[PDB]
């Protein structure tokens, strides 16, 4: 059981509609805690989780360090868009997107499990730092321009330094400073609703509301037989208050409801639940 500090960068051009835009968000597990948007008047790194409102007293240079980092990053991806556009011999007319995802996965006692730094151009893989954190994989011929640049500059070592160092150290600071929010293991609120459609066919919908973290498993069973192939599993959604929701639906023979059970697996649950429906 690990925790994660992950960052997400999106920089897209407005080919005739202002300079490019740069947006960066940071996550600890499934909770967002920081943001940066280059469109603001004088853009700054800003808190998005409660415990981040105390980082100014705990680290008096955190906001200016990261604001300077993000504003700098916005500049280099602005140029990066033009470089990559020339790599593919693309015109100035279209809009294009650079995406970046990096962070660390850390096991219980503060031990690093894996770092990563992956980038995409127009929604497809471009270059990624390998698992040994010492080499890059370019996805196409155009990305070999970037890989040759980054190899000769030794950028993999600087990435490994961060991923093995500050990434683990700040995931630990965040975990402890935000233990209330992050180490939370809230089970879902579960219940089964009902929507007949015929005098002859009926929908059973098994809900799970307000759970954190996002990982959850909903399974429908008929007399102990898994009905995964026959159910309608909706994509998990953010509840708007730092938690999540998800339901699984089945269509059953009317009158034969009590042979169907909903199996719910969540981390903040004592044991997996088996749910029947009852009038």
């Amino acid at each position: 059981g690990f925790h994660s500090l992950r960052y997400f960068y999106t920089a897209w051009s407005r080919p005739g509609s202002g300079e490019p835009r740069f947006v960066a968000v940071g996550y600890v597990d499934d909770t967002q805690f920081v943001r940066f948007d280059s469109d603001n008047a004088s853009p700054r790194a800003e808190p998005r989780a409660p415990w981040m409102d105390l980082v100014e007293q705990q680290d008096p240079q955190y906001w200016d360090r990261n604001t300077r980092n993000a504003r700098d990053a916005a500049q280099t991806y602005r140029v990066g868009l033009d470089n990559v556009r020339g790599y593919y011999n693309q015109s100035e007319a279209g809009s294009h997107t650079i995406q970046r995802m990096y962070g660390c996965d850390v096991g219980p006692h503060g031990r690093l499990l894996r770092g990563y730094d992956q980038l995409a151009y127009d929604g497809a893989d471009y270059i990624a730092l390998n698992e040994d954190l010492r080499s890059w994989t370019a996805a196409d011929l155009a990305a070999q321009n970037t890989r040759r640049k980054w190899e000769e500059a030794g950028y993999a070592e600087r990435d490994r330094a961060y991923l093995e160092g500050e990434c683990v150290e700040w995931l630990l600071k965040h975990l402890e400073n935000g233990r209330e929010t992050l180490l939370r293991a809230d089970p879902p609120k579960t219940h089964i609703t009902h929507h007949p459609i015929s005098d002859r066919e009926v929908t059973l919908r098994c809900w799970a509301l307000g759970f954190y973290p996002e990982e959850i498993t909903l399974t429908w069973q008929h007399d102990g037989e898994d009905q995964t192939q026959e159910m309608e599993l909706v994509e998990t959604r953010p509840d708007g208050n730092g938690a999540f929701q998800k339901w699984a639906a089945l269509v059953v023979p009317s009158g034969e409801e009590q042979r169907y059970t909903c199996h719910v697996q969540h981390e903040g649950l004592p044991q997996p639940l088996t749910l029947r429906w009852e009038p």
Binding site: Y62, N69, A73, Y77, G80, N83, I127, A153, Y162
Partner: peptide
């Protein structure tokens, strides 16, 4: 903290 940003 943010990591370093490298130029494409």
């Amino acid at each position: 903290d943010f990591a370093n940003t490298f130029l494409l």
